[PDB]
Structure 1
Amino acid sequence: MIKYYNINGQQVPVENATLHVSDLSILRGYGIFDYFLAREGHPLFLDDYLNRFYRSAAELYLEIPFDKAELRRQIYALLQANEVREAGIILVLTGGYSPDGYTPVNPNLLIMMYDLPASAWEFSAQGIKIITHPFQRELPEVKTINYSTGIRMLKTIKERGATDLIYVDQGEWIRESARSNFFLVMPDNTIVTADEKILWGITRRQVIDAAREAGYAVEERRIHITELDQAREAFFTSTIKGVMAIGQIDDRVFGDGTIGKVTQELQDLFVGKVKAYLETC
């Protein structure tokens, strides 16, 4: 059971883990987020996740209080303190306890810890049902805390019989969901995913590398909404999903709705990347 989180380098019991209401995340949604899994006592691809956290932080001009080695030390320390080998880990960096409820100061750094999600890498053979939604995320290259459109859409998603969405910039250009990268497999087995105005996911990185190592053509380009009709397969990548089959987008079933051949092969290769990472720890 999880005992402690970390706030600004201090291990705190979870029930005393609070921020004063003057924090800019609370008042102004100002801050950055990262999330990664731990397996066999090891945060997966940690250097990549931590590099991204420091890059996100730079774009909001927030100084993380310690260097990457120290943050890594604190993460490992919090796994040992909670006596856990398998976990979800959130990093949050807020704009801080602003004097004027707008100007950022020293940021508040949060490290929170959860059980490894039950659904982590479920790899269901049955593809999920999703809807298109016209929208473009703000500062899309930055992993901000700003998830209001995706959270607000939950009601419409569930209402319409979907479990998720795919953002289409002005109903024209396929991007990503609120929390997942999006990919198409073409009938010639070319893999397509968005290159611009999307978050560069750590899963997306490992899956693209694994696809190119298997000899797949992987095109990073703008994707027109009409190109859904060209695709055999659709999947998401994310830290929790790994590779997740999408069986339906609006009124289009992909194949018979069950996971496509390349999607299944990419699930195995993703697990290959994980195992290869854990062999270097």
Structure 2
Amino acid sequence: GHMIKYYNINGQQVPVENATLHVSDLSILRGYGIFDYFLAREGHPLFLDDYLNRFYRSAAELYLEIPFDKAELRRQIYALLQANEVREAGIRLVLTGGYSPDGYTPVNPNLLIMMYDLPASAWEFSAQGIKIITHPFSTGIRMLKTIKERGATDLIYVDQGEWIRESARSNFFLVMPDNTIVTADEKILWGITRRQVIDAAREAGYAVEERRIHITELDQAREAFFTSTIKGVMAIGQIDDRVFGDGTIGKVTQELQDLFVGKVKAYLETC
């Protein structure tokens, strides 16, 4: 793996061993802050402008002012890849509520850029679908316990015992026997992987329905998968007691996995 030498705090490259915040930061005291996370390959953060747009939208929703414009943040991110001498990386952006003279009032958010090594494994996909559970409904990390204990590696939620509700971590998709792709709607552009995969499905001539999913629809679907930054397209083989196909990646899920890699390749060709 790779020694990461530097993070970035408020536009200054800081050796990892000195990368600290004073405990008056409102993320420490009150968990007030936003983040984004994205990959880089061949020295380029993937779909970067979409991630940065999401990051600036998240900040404005919390009334936190990012201390640099998008072009400047983009420069800092590329400057940090070059300083750490990595071509493949995970990049975390953090905007805290910042240092507050009174432990409550945001007065100046703190901006962190952190960097991680990816194993070659990060870019590979399993033919074996994962096993998840449904669950009525901090919440997300708390839930790791219940999850591992039940022999699942993730979950989706049911609402009023009726409606599938996505976790924070992933977008959830069904493929119906007629090859209709079904996924929850969005008010504004949140899922970056979700967007590239819906685009790839429609370009391939698949029907994509963006709508509420009823619990009964898990029993009608041929395939189930997640999208996320880290997973890309990840096949779900089992939901509670429901096996999808033989538990291995479905036909459309496999096609969308390959088309997503195509979207990442096409993105990198424009860099």
TM-score range, shorter chain: over 0.9
Deviation string for 1:64-88 (max 9, x for gaps)?
0010000000000000000110000
- Give, in angstroms, the shift of residue 26 of structure 1: 1.3
Deviation string for 1:152-192 (max 9, x for gaps)?
01111000011111123343322323311111101110000
* 8 Å Cα contact 1:234-1:245 kept in structure 2: yes
Unaligned 5+ residue runs, structure 1?
A: 136-147
Q: Tell me which stretches of 4 or more aligned residues in structure 1 moved more than 6 Å.
A: none
For 1:274 and 1:109, locate their aligned partners in 2 and report how far apart those are by CA, in whole Å.
27
**Backbone CA RMSD of aligned residues:** 1.4
Deviation string for 1:96-138 (max 9, x for gaps)?
1123322212100000000125542431011000011222xxx
Deviation string for 1:168-226 (max 9, x for gaps)?
33433223233111111011100000014898210000000000000000001111111
For 2:158 and 2:57, locate their aligned partners in 1 and report how far apart those are by CA, in whole Å.
25
Identity %: 100
Corresponding residue number in structure 1 for 2:250: 260
TM-score (norm 2): 0.96
- Give, in angstroms, the shift of residue 50 of structure 1: 0.3
* 8 Å Cα contact 2:10-2:112 kept in structure 1: yes
* 8 Å Cα contact 2:175-2:181 kept in structure 1: yes
* 8 Å Cα contact 1:120-1:242 kept in structure 2: no
- Give, in angstroms, the shift of residue 151 of structure 1: 0.5
Which deviates the most, 200-209 or 110-119? 110-119
Deviation string for 1:43-96 (max 9, x for gaps)?
000000000000000100000001000000000000000011000000000111
Aligned residues: 269
The verdict on how the C-alpha distance between 1:130 and 1:198 changes in structure 2, with shifts beyond 3 A counting, is farther
Which deviates the most, 262-271 or 192-201? 192-201
For 1:191 and 1:5, locate their aligned partners in 2 and report how far apart those are by CA, in whole Å.
40
The verdict on how the C-alpha distance between 1:193 and 1:121 changes in structure 2, with shifts beyond 3 A counting, is farther
TM-score (norm 1): 0.92
Which deviates the most, 109-118 or 59-68? 109-118
Unaligned 5+ residue runs, structure 2?
A: none
